[PDB]
Scaffold this active site. Structure first.
Site, PDB file in Angstrom:
ATOM      1  N   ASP A   1      -8.791 -46.596 141.189  1.00 15.18           N
ATOM      2  CA  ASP A   1      -8.330 -47.038 139.879  1.00 15.18           C
ATOM      3  C   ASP A   1      -8.775 -48.421 139.462  1.00 15.18           C
ATOM      4  O   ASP A   1      -8.224 -49.406 139.929  1.00 15.18           O
ATOM      5  CB  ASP A   1      -6.812 -46.991 139.850  1.00 15.18           C
ATOM      6  CG  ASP A   1      -6.240 -47.560 138.579  1.00 15.18           C
ATOM      7  OD1 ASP A   1      -6.836 -47.331 137.513  1.00 15.18           O
ATOM      8  OD2 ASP A   1      -5.187 -48.222 138.636  1.00 15.18           O
TER       9      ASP A   1
ATOM     10  N   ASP B   1     -11.614 -48.146 132.393  1.00 16.88           N
ATOM     11  CA  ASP B   1     -10.582 -47.785 133.364  1.00 16.88           C
ATOM     12  C   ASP B   1     -10.658 -46.394 134.021  1.00 16.88           C
ATOM     13  O   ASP B   1     -10.154 -45.408 133.484  1.00 16.88           O
ATOM     14  CB  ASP B   1      -9.232 -48.009 132.660  1.00 16.88           C
ATOM     15  CG  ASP B   1      -8.059 -47.382 133.374  1.00 16.88           C
ATOM     16  OD1 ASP B   1      -8.139 -47.150 134.592  1.00 16.88           O
ATOM     17  OD2 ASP B   1      -7.032 -47.144 132.706  1.00 16.88           O
TER      18      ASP B   1
END
Ligand SMILES: Cc1cccc(CNC[C@@H](O)[C@H](Cc2ccccc2)NC(=O)C2=Cc3ccccc3Oc3ccccc32)c1
Length: 374
Positions: free
Chosen positions: A33, A217
């Site tokens: 992430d 992201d």
């Protein structure tokens, strides 16, 4: 840097890296992430995971003495903060000491069908909870492995991907690699200039796209656009093929559309392009995804060949360039030179056909100046 194919997963539930934790080693599957900064793994059994890290069985685990809790866009967990040795099988076979959160309470964090049980935040220290003082996984890796303060990622899905830690693997991309400056060092924030659709720009105050932030992201499945923009886009994507019947529920993501024919409904949607300022103010370059990347297919079932979900979601405050967009490029997080680079990703093909494009530079000197409102 033979960390190629070191990631498993897809746009659906994320891409994960396999790492060994503690002494003796415990095999875990970590979700990569770039949208956060904490290392955390399942600390107890849980509804959708088949394993977790047991601190009591690791002679190298030291408790740091406190609990920490992180809340993402949606979902959250709470765990004990500690330290332990980590080994990333494919890549670095010389274990290093990293902070580690052991989840003992989560809510909407582990979903059905995920194959991972931990999340690896590769963002900046600022974003780390409880505070910028709980050194980032990467921050550690950099110091201890004495590698360059860089890492690149490539997701393949439409197979897994590659998380090259500490460099750029040239065999993963053909063509030139464009860079855009990182505006604020927390999330990987960059400034978006225009947003073209079917070649038609949206014609919106460029500050719109950057309010209040546009981040790259991997930890976010869809391409999220702040409301006003989302609408503009949807309207656009619609107009450019009002023929087909995809109900407003489809756009909301509430439903999926199923096709009963062997022919894919892709040729009917427009391309979507995002313009990013180049390191050289006067110019900009643009990344593009064809519909194969945003009209994403799901298992057939029944008399249907497959069903499709809309790869774009509306946001309240933020423009999140997630998986649906990254799945088409090789993203380089050059933390050292404060910039993010993109490159046409080869594995992002469908029937020997490119599904993403990148080109430049285009003139910026005509519109903008600084699209990040203060
Ligand atoms: C610290 C903090 C607070 C607010 C916002 C951020 C920005 N990045 C969010 C990711 O870190 C997070 C990673 C993650 C992965 C698995 C389970 C939980 C969290 N994903 C998301 O929050 C996230 C956001 C959204 C929001 C709307 C539509 C799709 C989508 O993407 C997905 C898809 C699956 C799971 C979480 C997630 C960071």
């Amino acid at each position: 840097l033979a960390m190629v194919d070191n990631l498993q997963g897809d746009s659906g539930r994320g891409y994960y890296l396999e790492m060994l934790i503690g002494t003796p080693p415990q095999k875990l599957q970590i979700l990569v992430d770039t949208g956060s900064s904490n290392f955390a793994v399942a600390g107890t059994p849980h509804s959708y995971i088949d394993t977790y890290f047991d601190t009591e069985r690791s002679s190298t685990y030291r408790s740091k003495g406190f609990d920490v809790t992180v809340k993402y866009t949606q979902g959250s967990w709470t765990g004990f903060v500690g330290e332990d040795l980590v080994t990333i099988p494919k890549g670095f076979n010389t274990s290093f000491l990293v902070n580690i959160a052991t989840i003992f309470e989560s809510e909407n964090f582990f979903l059905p069908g995920i194959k991972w049980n931990g999340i690896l935040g590769l963002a900046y220290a600022t974003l780390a909870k409880p505070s910028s003082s709980l050194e980032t996984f990467f921050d550690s890796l950099v110091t201890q492995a004495n590698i360059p303060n860089v890492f690149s990622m490539q997701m393949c899905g439409a197979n897994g991907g590659s998380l090259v830690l500490g460099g750029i693997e040239p065999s993963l991309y053909k063509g030139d690699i464009w860079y855009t400056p990182i505006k604020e060092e927390w999330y990987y924030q960059i400034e978006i200039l225009k947003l073209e659709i079917g070649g038609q720009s949206l014609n919106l105050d460029c500050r719109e796209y950057n309010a209040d932030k546009a981040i790259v992201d991997s930890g976010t499945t869809l391409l999220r656009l702040p409301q006003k923009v989302f609408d503009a886009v949807v309207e656009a994507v619609a107009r450019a093929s009002l023929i087909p019947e995809f109900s407003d529920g489809f756009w909301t993501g509430s439903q999926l559309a199923c096709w009963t024919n062997s022919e894919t409904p892709w040729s009917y949607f427009p391309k979507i392009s995002i313009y990013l300022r180049d390191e050289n103010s006067s110019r900009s370059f643009r990344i593009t995804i064809l519909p194969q990347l945003y009209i994403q297919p799901m298992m057939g079932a029944g008399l249907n060949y497959e069903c499709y979900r809309f790869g774009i979601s509306p946001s309240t405050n933020a423009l999140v360039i997630g998986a649906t967009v990254m799945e088409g490029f090789y993203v380089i997080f050059d933390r050292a030179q404060k910039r993010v680079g993109f490159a046409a990703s080869p594995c992002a093909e469908i029937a020997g056909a490119a599904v993403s494009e990148i080109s430049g530079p285009f003139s910026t000197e005509d519109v903008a100046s600084n699209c990040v409102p203060a």
